Amino acid sequence: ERRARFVSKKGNCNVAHKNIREQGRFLQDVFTTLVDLKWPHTLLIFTMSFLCSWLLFAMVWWLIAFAHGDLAPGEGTNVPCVTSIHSFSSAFLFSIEVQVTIGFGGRMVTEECPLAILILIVQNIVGLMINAIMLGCIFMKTAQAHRRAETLIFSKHAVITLRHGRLCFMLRVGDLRKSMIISATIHMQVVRKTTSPEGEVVPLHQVDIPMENGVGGNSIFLVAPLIIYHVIDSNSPLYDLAPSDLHHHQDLEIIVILEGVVETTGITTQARTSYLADEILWGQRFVPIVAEEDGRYSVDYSKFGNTVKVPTPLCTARQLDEDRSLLDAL
C-alpha cells in the first residue's frame, strides 16, 4: 500500500480533519479567511464587492429618479433630483462616481430631493467602510510571509553518525535569501505510534527532541547552512534505533520546525520538514560546504545535500553505552 506522512517535505500537514461540528467558525473570521485566499481568488471577492456595491446603489439612484419623475422623457418643468439621469446607465455611472470619488459633475446631487441627500450620505459611508475593509485585507496579504518559508531549505535526507564519541542525528538547514530571520528557533520532534507500560496507546505520539545547542536552548543563527544534530543520550527516544529497522515500513518520523520573525516585515514564519525512516542514512557525514574566498566565504549550495560514507559502528546507541562501560571497566 503506502506509508502516510505526518507533514510533507514542504510542510503541508497531511492530516484530514473530519466530523467537524461546525458552528460557523469558518465564516466568523472573514478577515482571516479573506487573507488565506489565493491572490486570483481575492480579486474576485475584491472585484465583486465593489461591483455589487456600485450596482446596489445604481438601483437606488435609478429608483429615486424614477419616483421623482426625473427620467420622464422630455425637458420637464421640475428640477431634477440628480442632474443628467436619463437612463439606468446614467444611474450606474453616477453610482460609480460617488463611491469611487471621481465626481465628474455632469451628474450633480441637487438641493431639491432630501432622500438623495441621505442616499449620498449612505453611499459615502458605505464607500469609505468597504474601501477601509479592502485596504486592511490587502495590507495583511502584502504582509504575508508564507512564501518566505519557501526559501528556507532543508536537506533531502538526514544522517545518523559519529561526532565526539556520541551518536547524533545530524541534518542540514539553509537559508537562500539574503535577509535574516531574527530570533530563529528549531524544534525537532519524533513521531511514532507509542504505547505505554500503563496500557495506553497513543496513535501519533510527538516527543520533543533537544537540538544539542551550546547553551541548551533553541536559538540558532542562520546565515550559512548549519547542522542541526541531536545527541542520542540515555533519554533520547532514538536510543533504540537499530540500523536494521531503518527500512521503509518503520513507524518513525522526525519533524523539524524552524521559526523566526522575518526581518523585512516582522512576521513570524515556520518551515517544516519530516524525515521518514527511509530518509535517514546511517553512518554518513555532510560534506564541507563553506569554502574561503579572497576576502569572504563561499557556500556551495550544489553540495547542500551531498553525503559521503564514513566508518561507524552498526550497533544501536544503547549498545554503545554498554560497549563503552565494559571497556572502561576493563
Binding site: 539574503k178 563561499s298 550544489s302
Partner: protein, 624 residues
C-alpha cells in the same frame, strides 16, 4: 499644425469611421500600437523591480541558468524581427515626406514595436536566468495579441488590393510570419516545460558542468547575443585590471572542451571508422576521415558564418555605389510618388534609392558581417584547440603502448617525438584555424571578381589580374623567406649550443684567461649566422613591398587603363569609389590565400608524419 496621428491633411478627414472601423487605414494602425504599449507597461514595472533589486542582488554573483527550449530560435527571430522593424521605420519616414502633414501612423506604430521587441527579449532573458517560466504568459499574450492585430492589418491591405509591388505590403506580410513563428516558440516552451496547465511540470536543472564553481569560461552557455559579442568577457577583462590573471582566474575548462572529452570523441571517430569500414591500415586518409567525423559538425558551422560574412562584406561596396549614385544626380526635388489612399505607399526600387536608407542598411549589414566573421573565427579556433587537445592525448596514449626496441627507440629519439607535439601538431592545429578560408576565400574572390566586372567594366578585371598574376610570385617569395629562415634557425641553435658550453665552464674559461679566445668563436659563428639573417630580412622586406605596392599598382593600372584603353565612362564617384572598397576587400583574401595553401601543404605532411608514427611497433601481449 499640431501632431496628428492619422493624416492631418484633407481638413483632418482621416478619422471618419464610416464603412466599418477596420476599413479606416489609420485605425488598423492604431490597433497595432496597443499590443506594444500593453507589454511596454506590463513588463516595465516587472523589470524595474529586478533592476532595482539587481543593484543589491548577491545570488546572481555565481548563479546558474537554463535556456528554455527554443533559446536559439528565439534570438535569431528577434534579430530578424528587429531588422525588419527598422525597414518599416525607414519606409514610414520615407512616405510621409511628400505630404504636408506628419502622418505619424506610418512609423510610430513600428517605432513602438521596435521598443517593444527589444524589451520582449530583455524581459524574456530575465525570465531565462531566473528559471521562472510562469512570467512567459505575459510574453505569450504579446505574441498572440501582436500576431492577431498585425494579421488583420495584412488582410485589410489585400482587401484594398495593395499588392506585393508596395513595400509596406511586403514588410507587413513578413511581420505576420515573424510574429507567428515567435508565437510558436512561446507555445513550444509550454510543451517542453509544461508550466501553465499541466499538473506535473517537467522542470529542468542547470547543466552539471555549469554548476561547477571552478568553471569560468562561460562561452558555451550564454545568451546568443553574448555568444556573438563576447559580452561575458567584460567582467573578466575588468578583473584583469585589479587582480592579475593567473591559473586562479582562468578556471577549469568546460566539459565540451576538456581533453578527455575530446579524446573520447576522437576514439569514437576511430572506433566507428574501423567498425563501419574494415580497413587494415591507419593511413593518412584514415586520420583525415577520422578528424572530419569528430569535428566536422563544428567546422561546417564556422564555414557557414564565414560564407555569410563574406557575402555581407560586399554590402559595403554596393551601399557605397548606391549612396553616391543617388548623390550624383542634381535632381533632388523628385521623390517617390505613387498612391493608394493618399498615404503614398512607397515601392521597392524607390526604397533603396534614398541615400539615408542605404546608410542605415549598411549599418545593419556591417553589424552582421563583423559579428558573423568574428564568430567564424571562434568556432574555427575552438575546434582547432580541441583538435590539438584530442591529438596530444592520442599521441601521448601512443607513447605508453610503444615498444623500446633499439630499431625503434634508437631511431626516433625524444627530440623526434618532442617536435611532433610542438611543430607537427601546431601546424596541424593551425590548419583547422584556417580551414574555413580555403572553402570561402575562392568564393569571396570570385564574388568579388563577378561584381567588380559589373561595377567598372573590363578595366577592373585587367587591373585585378595584376593582383592575381603577381600572387604566384608572392608564393615564391614566402617559400624563399622560409628557406632563409631555416638557415638562421639552424645556425642560431649551433651558436647558442656553442655558447652554452662557454657559459657552462666559465670559471675554467675565466681563471685560465680563455674568455678573449672563446668569445672570438662566438663572433665568427655569428657572422655566418648574420649573413643568413640578412637574407631572411631581405625576403621579409620584399614581402611587405609586394603586400602593399600591388594594390596601388592594381588601382594605377585599373583607372589609367579604363581612361586610355577603354574610355567607356567618366568614372563617377558612384563607380570609382565603389571599386576602391572592392580592392580593399579583395586584397586581404587574395594576398593571404597563399598562406592558407602553405598551411594546408604543411598540414598534409603533419598528418602523413603523424600517421607514420602512430602505426609503429607496439607493446604486444597487453590484451592477453
Amino acid at each position: 499644425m499640431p501632431l496628428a496621428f492619422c493624416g492631418t491633411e484633407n481638413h483632418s478627414a482621416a478619422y471618419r469611421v464610416d464603412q466599418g472601423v477596420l476599413n479606416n487605414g489609420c485605425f488598423v494602425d492604431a490597433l497595432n500600437v496597443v499590443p506594444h504599449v500593453f507589454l511596454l507597461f506590463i513588463t516595465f514595472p516587472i523589470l524595474f523591480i529586478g533592476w532595482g533589486s539587481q543593484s543589491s542582488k548577491v545570488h546572481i554573483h555565481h548563479s546558474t541558468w537554463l535556456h528554455f527550449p527554443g533559446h536559439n530560435l528565439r534570438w535569431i527571430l528577434t534579430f530578424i524581427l528587429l531588422f525588419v522593424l527598422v525597414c518599416e521605420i525607414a519606409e514610414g519616414i520615407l512616405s510621409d515626406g511628400v505630404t504636408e502633414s506628419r502622418h505619424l501612423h506610418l512609423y510610430m506604430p513600428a517605432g513602438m514595436a521596435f521598443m517593444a521587441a527589444i524589451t520582449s527579449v530583455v524581459y524574456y532573458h530575465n525570465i531565462e536566468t531566473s528559471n521562472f517560466p510562469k512570467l512567459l504568459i505575459a510574453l505569450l499574450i504579446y505574441w498572440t495579441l501582436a500576431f492577431i492585430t498585425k494579421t488583420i492589418k495584412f488582410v485589410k491591405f489585400y482587401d484594398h488590393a495593395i499588392g506585393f509591388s508596395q513595400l509596406r505590403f511586403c514588410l507587413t506580410g513578413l511581420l505576420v510570419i515573424l510574429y507567428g513563428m515567435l508565437l510558436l516558440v512561446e507555445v513550444n516552451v509550454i510543451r517542453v516545460r509544461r508550466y501553465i496547465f499541466f499538473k506535473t511540470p517537467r522542470e529542468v536543472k542547470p547543466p552539471e558542468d555549469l554548476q561547477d564553481l571552478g568553471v569560468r569560461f562561460l562561452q558555451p552557455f550564454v545568451n546568443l547575443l553574448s555568444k556573438g559579442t563576447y559580452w561575458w568577457m567584460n567582467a573578466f577583462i575588468k578583473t584583469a585590471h585589479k587582480k592579475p590573471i593567473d591559473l586562479r582566474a582562468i578556471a577549469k575548462l568546460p566539459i565540451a572542451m576538456r581533453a578527455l572529452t575530446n579524446y573520447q570523441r576522437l576514439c569514437v571517430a576511430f572506433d566507428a571508422q574501423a567498425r563501419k569500414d574494415t580497413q587494415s591500415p591507419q593511413g593518412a586518409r584514415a586520420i583525415w576521415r577520422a578528424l572530419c567525423h569528430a569535428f566536422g559538425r563544428r567546422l561546417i558551422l564556422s564555414s557557414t558564418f564565414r560564407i555569410l560574412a563574406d557575402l555581407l562584406g560586399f554590402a559595403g561596396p554596393l551601399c557605397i555605389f548606391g549612396i553616391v549614385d543617388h548623390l550624383g544626380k542634381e535632381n533632388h526635388v523628385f521623390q517617390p510618388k505613387t498612391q493608394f489612399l493618399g498615404v503614398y505607399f512607397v515601392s521597392s526600387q524607390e526604397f533603396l534609392g534614398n541615400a539615408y536608407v542605404l546608410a542605415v542598411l549598411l549599418f545593419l549589414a556591417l553589424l552582421l558581417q563583423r559579428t558573423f566573421l568574428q564568430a567564424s573565427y571562434y568556432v574555427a579556433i575552438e575546434t582547432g584547440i580541441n583538435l590539438r587537445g584530442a591529438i596530444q592525448t592520442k599521441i601521448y596514449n601512443k607513447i605508453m603502448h610503444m615498444s623500446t626496441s633499439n630499431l625503434s627507440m634508437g631511431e626516433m629519439t625524444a627530440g623526434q617525438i618532442c617536435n611532433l607535439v610542438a611543430i607537427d601538431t601546431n601546424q596541424l592545429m593551425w590548419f583547422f584555424f584556417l580551414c574555413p578560408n580555403l572553402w570561402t576565400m575562392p568564393v569571396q574572390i570570385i564574388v568579388g571578381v563577378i561584381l567588380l566586372y559589373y561595377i567598372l567594366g573590363v578595366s577592373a578585371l585587367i587591373g585585378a589580374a595584376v593582383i592575381i598574376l603577381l600572387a604566384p610570385v608572392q608564393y615564391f617569395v614566402a617559400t624563399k623567406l622560409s628557406q632563409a629562415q631555416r638557415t638562421t634557425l639552424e645556425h642560431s641553435n649551433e651558436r647558442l649550443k656553442q655558447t652554452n658550453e662557454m657559459l657552462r665552464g666559465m670559471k675554467l674559461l675565466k681563471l685560465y684567461a680563455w674568455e678573449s679566445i672563446f668569445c672570438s668563436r662566438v663572433e665568427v659563428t655569428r657572422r655566418k649566422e648574420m649573413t643568413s639573417l640578412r637574407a631572411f630580412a631581405v625576403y621579409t622586406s620584399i614581402s611587405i613591398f609586394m603586400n602593399t605596392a600591388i594594390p596601388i599598382a592594381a588601382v594605377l593600372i585599373t583607372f589609367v587603363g579604363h581612361v586610355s584603353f577603354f574610355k567607356e565612362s567618366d568614372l563617377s564617384p558612384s563607380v570609382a569609389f565603389a571599386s576602391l572598397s572592392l580592392f580593399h576587400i579583395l586584397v586581404t583574401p587574395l594576398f593571404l590565400l597563399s598562406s592558407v595553401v602553405r598551411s594546408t601543404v604543411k598540414a598534409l605532411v603533419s598528418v602523413q608524419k603523424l600517421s607514420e608514427f602512430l602505426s609503429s611497433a607496439e607493446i604486444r601481449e597487453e590484451q592477453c
